[PDB]
Amino acid sequence: MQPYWAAIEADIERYLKKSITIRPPETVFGPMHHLTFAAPATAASTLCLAACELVGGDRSQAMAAAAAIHLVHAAAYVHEHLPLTDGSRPVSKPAIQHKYGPNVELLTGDGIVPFGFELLAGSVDPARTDDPDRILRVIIEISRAGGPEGMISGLHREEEIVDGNTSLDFIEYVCKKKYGEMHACGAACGAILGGAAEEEIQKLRNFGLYQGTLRGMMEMKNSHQLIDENIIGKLKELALEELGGKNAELMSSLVA
Amino acid sequence: MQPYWAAIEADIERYLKKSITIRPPETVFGPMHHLTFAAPATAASTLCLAACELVGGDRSQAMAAAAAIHLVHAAAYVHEHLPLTDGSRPVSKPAIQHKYGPNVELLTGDGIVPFGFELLAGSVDPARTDDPDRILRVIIEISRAGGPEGMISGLHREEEIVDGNTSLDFIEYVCKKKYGEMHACGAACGAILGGAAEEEIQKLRNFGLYQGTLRGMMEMKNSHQLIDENIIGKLKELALEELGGFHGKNAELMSSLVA
Amino acid sequence: MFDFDGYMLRKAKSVNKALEAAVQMKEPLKIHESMRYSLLAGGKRVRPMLCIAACELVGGDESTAMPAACAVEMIHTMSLMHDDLPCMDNDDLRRGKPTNHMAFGESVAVLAGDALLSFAFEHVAAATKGAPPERIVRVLGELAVSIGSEGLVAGQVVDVCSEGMAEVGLDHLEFIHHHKTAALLQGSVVLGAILGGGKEEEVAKLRKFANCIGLLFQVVDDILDVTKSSKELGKTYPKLIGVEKSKEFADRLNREAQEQLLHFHPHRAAPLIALANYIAYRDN
Amino acid sequence: MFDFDGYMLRKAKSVNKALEAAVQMKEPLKIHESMRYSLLAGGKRVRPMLCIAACELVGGDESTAMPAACAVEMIHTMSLMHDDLPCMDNDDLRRGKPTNHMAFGESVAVLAGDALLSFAFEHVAAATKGAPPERIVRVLGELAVSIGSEGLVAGQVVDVCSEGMAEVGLDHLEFIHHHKTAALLQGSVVLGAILGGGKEEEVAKLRKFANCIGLLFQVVDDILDVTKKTTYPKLIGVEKSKEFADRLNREAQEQLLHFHPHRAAPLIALANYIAYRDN
Numbered sequence A: 001m002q003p004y005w006a007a008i009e010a011d012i013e014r015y016l017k018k019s020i021t022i023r024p025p026e027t028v029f030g031p032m033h034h035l036t037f038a039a040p041a042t043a044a045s046t047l048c049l050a051a052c053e054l055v056g057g058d059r060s061q062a063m064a065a066a067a068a069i070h071l072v073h074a075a076a077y078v079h080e081h082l083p084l085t086d087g088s089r090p091v092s093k094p095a096i097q098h099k100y101g102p103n104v105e106l107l108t109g110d111g112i113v114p115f116g117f118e119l120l121a122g123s124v125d126p127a128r129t130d131d132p133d134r135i136l137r138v139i140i141e142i143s144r145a146g147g148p149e150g151m152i153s154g155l156h157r158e159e160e161i162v163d164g165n166t167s168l169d170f171i172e173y174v175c176k177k178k179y180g181e182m183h184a185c186g187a188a189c190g191a192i193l194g195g196a197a198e199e200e201i202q203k204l205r206n207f208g209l210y211q212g213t214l215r216g217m218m219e220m221k222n223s224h225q226l227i228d229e230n231i232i233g234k235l236k237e238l239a240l241e242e243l244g245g246k247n248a249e250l251m252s253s254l255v256a
Numbered sequence B: 001m002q003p004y005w006a007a008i009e010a011d012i013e014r015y016l017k018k019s020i021t022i023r024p025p026e027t028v029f030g031p032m033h034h035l036t037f038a039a040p041a042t043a044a045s046t047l048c049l050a051a052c053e054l055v056g057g058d059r060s061q062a063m064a065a066a067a068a069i070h071l072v073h074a075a076a077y078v079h080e081h082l083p084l085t086d087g088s089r090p091v092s093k094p095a096i097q098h099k100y101g102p103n104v105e106l107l108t109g110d111g112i113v114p115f116g117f118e119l120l121a122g123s124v125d126p127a128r129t130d131d132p133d134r135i136l137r138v139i140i141e142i143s144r145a146g147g148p149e150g151m152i153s154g155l156h157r158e159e160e161i162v163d164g165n166t167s168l169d170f171i172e173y174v175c176k177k178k179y180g181e182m183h184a185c186g187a188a189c190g191a192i193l194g195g196a197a198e199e200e201i202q203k204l205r206n207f208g209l210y211q212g213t214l215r216g217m218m219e220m221k222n223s224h225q226l227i228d229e230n231i232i233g234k235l236k237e238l239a240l241e242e243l244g245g246f247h248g249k250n251a252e253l254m255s256s257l258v259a
Numbered sequence C: 001m002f003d004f005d006g007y008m009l010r011k012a013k014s015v016n017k018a019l020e021a022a023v024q025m026k027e028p029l030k031i032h033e034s035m036r037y038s039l040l041a042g043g044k045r046v047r048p049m050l051c052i053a054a055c056e057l058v059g060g061d062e063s064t065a066m067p068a069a070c071a072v073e074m075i076h077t078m079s080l081m082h083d084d085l086p087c088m089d090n091d092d093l094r095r096g097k098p099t100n101h102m103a104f105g106e107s108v109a110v111l112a113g114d115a116l117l118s119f120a121f122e123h124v125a126a127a128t129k130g131a132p133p134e135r136i137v138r139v140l141g142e143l144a145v146s147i148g149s150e151g152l153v154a155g156q157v158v159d160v161c162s163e164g165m166a167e168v169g170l171d172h173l174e175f176i177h178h179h180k181t182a183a184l185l186q187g188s189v190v191l192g193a194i195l196g197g198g199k200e201e202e203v204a205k206l207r208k209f210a211n212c213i214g215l216l217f218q219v220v221d222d223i224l225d226v227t228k229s230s231k232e233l234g235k236t237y238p239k240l241i242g243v244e245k246s247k248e249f250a251d252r253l254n255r256e257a258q259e260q261l262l263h264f265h266p267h268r269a270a271p272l273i274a275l276a277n278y279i280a281y282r283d284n
Numbered sequence D: 001m002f003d004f005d006g007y008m009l010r011k012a013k014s015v016n017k018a019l020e021a022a023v024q025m026k027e028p029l030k031i032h033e034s035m036r037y038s039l040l041a042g043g044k045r046v047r048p049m050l051c052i053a054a055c056e057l058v059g060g061d062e063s064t065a066m067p068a069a070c071a072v073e074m075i076h077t078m079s080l081m082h083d084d085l086p087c088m089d090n091d092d093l094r095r096g097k098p099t100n101h102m103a104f105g106e107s108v109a110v111l112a113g114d115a116l117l118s119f120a121f122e123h124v125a126a127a128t129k130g131a132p133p134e135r136i137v138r139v140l141g142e143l144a145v146s147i148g149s150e151g152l153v154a155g156q157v158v159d160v161c162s163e164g165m166a167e168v169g170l171d172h173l174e175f176i177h178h179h180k181t182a183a184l185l186q187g188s189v190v191l192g193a194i195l196g197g198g199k200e201e202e203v204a205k206l207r208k209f210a211n212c213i214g215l216l217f218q219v220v221d222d223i224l225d226v227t228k229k230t231t232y233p234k235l236i237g238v239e240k241s242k243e244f245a246d247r248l249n250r251e252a253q254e255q256l257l258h259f260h261p262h263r264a265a266p267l268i269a270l271a272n273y274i275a276y277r278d279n
């Protein structure tokens, strides 16, 4: 619970800082580093490791993946904050600070994303024999959740939210697409790398979907305030219902 | 058009006239009849009779579905030309002729559709074992084809078009939804009904999808000529390959619809 | 003893859940958002309950009837979405909220309405588990019959097409209510009866019964429309024979209706006997 | 070889066909409409050719390499998409057509480019057939490195951070070129070879070949703009720059000395073509 999700955010942050080493040229990695860690953590990575240990796997087995997921999140987070001149992207009041410039952020975001797969492909232990198929599947899962049918898709629609005049049904979708898909991907991957069977992988995959859709739903509440509870309930019900001990009923701590 | 296809089309009109008969209350059946044949003819409907023969079975078997497929289309046609007072949909130039007022049109279209399924449910022959299984599967293809992820998506997105200031890609998507989806349905349904087998169905389906889209673009040509022969051929092509594996005096006719 | 308020309150919950689930948000968003807006806005779920009750009554269970149950409420919804349009009634309130076209535009409303009509057939055809193919098809046919040119749509068109005819005979007015209102309630009970395994006689008996609470539900629609407030309701006989002689008739039907249920064991009929009185007696 | 253009034209078609298939229109329509706009814009398709050629070079089969071939074009396309953005080069045109962000806005341009980059990996991971997962994953790692901060992006980052300093040396210039240009060519050729069942030795030659012709392009391109800010001529003079180009072309062609004369012909041909261009 409390300090468990901590050792997780830590073991992940550590693995990232051990992998993104500022060096020549400090102009490239100077940003690649700052932006990778300047991005808020995403529950998706946490959920990735948690799911692994749940199915019985060793945390490290899904560390490259969890790292891969934060990178994709990070890269996307940066890009959704780039200042645009044509005003095609509505101005989000939570204006984050920009150390580096628009050209360096954009390119760094394009550098971070592939680094995730590098780590993945580059973490295949040739001594282990299921490592190949399990990672190839995870690369599919991750790239597919960060692609045009997933995250990208949520980022796009989000720009259609008029605030004071946008139903909750719509927002949930944007949240399902912006976070849900990624979180789904998260638990799903943690289970695959874990060695879980199709039965579990799916169940953990559904939980994540609802889990991520609920989390980002919480993010949204901040701004517009049609903060219904008949939606927070529906989701957690379906989330919990997707659980047929602790780790087996701890994932249900984010829905309380 | 080509003689073969006009003959099939004629049959469907006869079958439809046999099925739809003006009668009291004429206030209801008058509009239901006129609007049925007022809608443009669709190749997704005749594609069902043809596709059926190609795999073996007889046309008469697919007549019920082909009829429903035209009716679901008719309904959609009437609705897209509905006079919308609040300028919801981009009041387009079309302005076709309207015999009946908005209300009766809106409503009859809602009466056209269920009738498509009535004909199907009633087409069930007691001296047939599979009848219930194919007609159930076809009812699904049609309802889905006519669904919100089918024809309705095409109609919805179509409004988003602004004269000659929209890509070929976008327009091609619209035709794929508005026309391909239904056409693909008619090749499948016909196949299914004919008793065909998956691999065949799937193909005929893909064929219809492509043929349907090509047909859509062809009528989206006059709307604004710019459809280089590339998009057409790309489609024209794409469909034929699918037909690889169907031989006969019929199998070449199908190929004629796109060539 | 039988607790109606509860039986119905839970049947409605079960029904609202299945609905909410059958119609999810998905591309194209606005279209689906329009579907959910009117459908899950919450009604009384009178029709879907009739289906479920008729099914359980003859032997089967809710699970088997839920899809068709949800379907009839889908078509019932799209019918209201279309009745409110400018070319029709041009209304601004429905289920206590701005009309669908008012909220999404005349274009979306229609397309979202046509979607519900069509989707009702897909759902019943593909989601009904626990009934042989021929039976499912049969039901599809009955629902089609009940909402078409010899059913619901028929009542609606004859209705608008008689805007003037100030001769309004009780046969014209009988025809309207029978189709514009009774038609779908009849289909609801029938889909249920058949799907549960009901004998031709049980379907016949339930049909005639549904038919009864048909001319009834609407005689009420009229009495509630001409007594309640535009705010209580959330959105004709009481004209030719007055608002008083309309309550002398509405009874005859209620009884003549429950007399049809004597065909079944009074214990099993409790829901219908009941659901029949919430129809004769309700506040919207 | 005979008919080097016909060859490249064939490769381009087979590839364009596959690209159309791979990225189909769909919801959300603007994100995809943007992707196709830049991707199916019709070009030379050198990278996809380098990939397929490299595969067939080692008894590989074009079929097995098509997904990866498409993948490298997706990255190139998206690099060019972001490249034209206002915060960067800010170009309103490209090949006589409005640039991507001008047609769909900056937001879509950005996102669709992102969509092409991640899809690049998806398509390769899931569409690639005729090779063991160990090979595919490996190939994915290679694409990854070719476009990250040790490849494409590395080159494009130093280049934007260099427009300020006007005192660039051959060292600084060659880095920008190896990363912003040869990196992706290196990837392409390496993907084809791995998926083709190429020995590590073979894979290593091809990696070099690519680097030579990668550098070769920018040099010859610098020479031409003179026989018609920093450049090879400003640094070492034309005469010398040419000397380099010939050395580059000579070396590249040696890397292919041992594969079959016939299977190597296309690359040798592309090498010369890069050296003896009038524009």
Ligand SMILES: CC(C)=CCC/C(C)=C/COP(=O)(O)OP(=O)(O)O
Pocket (backbone or CB within 6 Å): C042, C043, C044, C045, C046, C076, C079, C080, C083, C095, C152, C156, C180, C181, C218, C221, C284
């Ligand atoms: C538009 C048409 C055909 C109207 C006639 C049928 C009718 C009286 C429906 C009202 O249903 P309801 O009173 O149960 O409304 P709700 O479902 O909102 O409770």
Ligand SMILES: [Mg+2]
Pocket (backbone or CB within 6 Å): C083, C084, C089, C091
């Ligand atoms: Mg009204």
Ligand SMILES: [Mg+2]
Pocket (backbone or CB within 6 Å): C083, C084, C091, C092, C093, C094, C235
């Ligand atoms: Mg109303």
Ligand SMILES: [Mg+2]
Pocket (backbone or CB within 6 Å): D083, D084, D089
């Ligand atoms: Mg540039």
Ligand SMILES: [Mg+2]
Pocket (backbone or CB within 6 Å): D083, D084, D089, D090, D091
């Ligand atoms: Mg530029």
